[PDB]
Amino acid sequence: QGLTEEQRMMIRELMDAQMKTFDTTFSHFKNFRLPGVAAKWSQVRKDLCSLKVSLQLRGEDGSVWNYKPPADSGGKEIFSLLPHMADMSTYMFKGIISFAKVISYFRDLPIEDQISLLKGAAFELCQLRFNTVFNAETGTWECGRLSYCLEDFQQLLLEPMLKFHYMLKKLQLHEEEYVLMQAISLFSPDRPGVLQHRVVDQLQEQFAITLKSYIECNRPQPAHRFLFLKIMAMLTELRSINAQHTQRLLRIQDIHPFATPLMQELFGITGS
Numbered sequence: 001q002g003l004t005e006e007q008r009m010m011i012r013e014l015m016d017a018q019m020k021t022f023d024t025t026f027s028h029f030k031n032f033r034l035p036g037v038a039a040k041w042s043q044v045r046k047d048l049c050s051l052k053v054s055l056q057l058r059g060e061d062g063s064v065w066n067y068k069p070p071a072d073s074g075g076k077e078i079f080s081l082l083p084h085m086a087d088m089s090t091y092m093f094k095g096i097i098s099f100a101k102v103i104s105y106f107r108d109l110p111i112e113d114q115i116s117l118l119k120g121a122a123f124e125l126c127q128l129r130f131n132t133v134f135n136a137e138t139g140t141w142e143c144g145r146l147s148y149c150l151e152d153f154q155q156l157l158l159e160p161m162l163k164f165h166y167m168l169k170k171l172q173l174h175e176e177e178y179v180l181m182q183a184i185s186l187f188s189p190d191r192p193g194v195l196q197h198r199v200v201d202q203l204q205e206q207f208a209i210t211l212k213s214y215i216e217c218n219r220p221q222p223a224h225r226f227l228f229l230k231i232m233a234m235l236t237e238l239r240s241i242n243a244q245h246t247q248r249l250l251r252i253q254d255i256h257p258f259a260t261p262l263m264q265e266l267f268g269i270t271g272s
């Protein structure tokens with residue numbers, strides 16, 4: 001530990017906010033919907049089938065419910081999982097909003113910038129949180145009583161969202177590094193509508209400096225050489241994935257509405 005007291009303060013506050021707002025066992029994700037018991041269109045079908053997962057639900061009693069999805073057959077069967085995705089996204093978004101609200105640097109910003117920043121980074125922070133429950137040996141997001149398994153190989157790693165999760169997992173990051181990644185991405189001075197550009201940008205530079213310093217003080221191994229720079233590269237990829245997934249959500253929403261009120265707020269949809 002070769003960190004200043006201000007740096008150690010910074011990490012402690014981020015770890016504290018994370019502890020208070022990340023429900024790592026997904027105990028409070030309840031009441032969710034489940035799948036039941038024209039070139040815009042080949043595109044939306046292209047958009048959807050890029051992520052095919054089976055779904056598993058462990059009962060508090062030992063029973064297991066298990067869902068294998070339909071093959072693509074040219075109709076509305078690719079839409080059966082969207083309400084559940086939306087309920088999960090919404091649940092994750094709430095934890096992310098609570099995370100920002102606990103952070104002092106975030107609270108001190110004007111409220112119009114708090115909103116602009118949350119709109120910009122919510123998806124990225126959710127992806128970063130999801131990577132900590134991702135099991136790269138089994139292709140599985142383990143969310144408590146609830147598992148999302150990738151369905152059958154290396155063609156799968158061609159999907160950028162999936163390549164990002166495998167690569168980020170291989171770096172074997174600490175809890176401290178994940179939360180500093182959340183901070184850096186949350187405090188991004190160039191999101192649409194940010195007014196305090198210079199303030200946000202100085203905050204960002206401090207969170208990045210803390211992370212570089214944390215790595216230099218606690219990871220001397222030749223396996224973590226350039227680790228800080230690999231992390232910054234992943235954050236750049238993640239912002240690109242973020243933009244690609246936003247256009248792809250809006251295309252689907254344009255022809256089959258599914259977004260919850262909170263998703264509409266975050267993605268700028270007004271209800272008219």
Ligand SMILES: C[C@H]1CCC[C@H](O)CCCCCc2cc(O)cc(O)c2C(=O)O1
Pocket residue numbers: 051053081082084085086088089130141143148161162
């Ligand atoms: C566990 C989470 C990881 C998303 C990570 C990345 O977004 C990977 C994309 C995999 C999405 C898996 C998934 C499919 C689905 O139909 C409904 C869902 O709620 C999820 C889902 O919640 O995936």
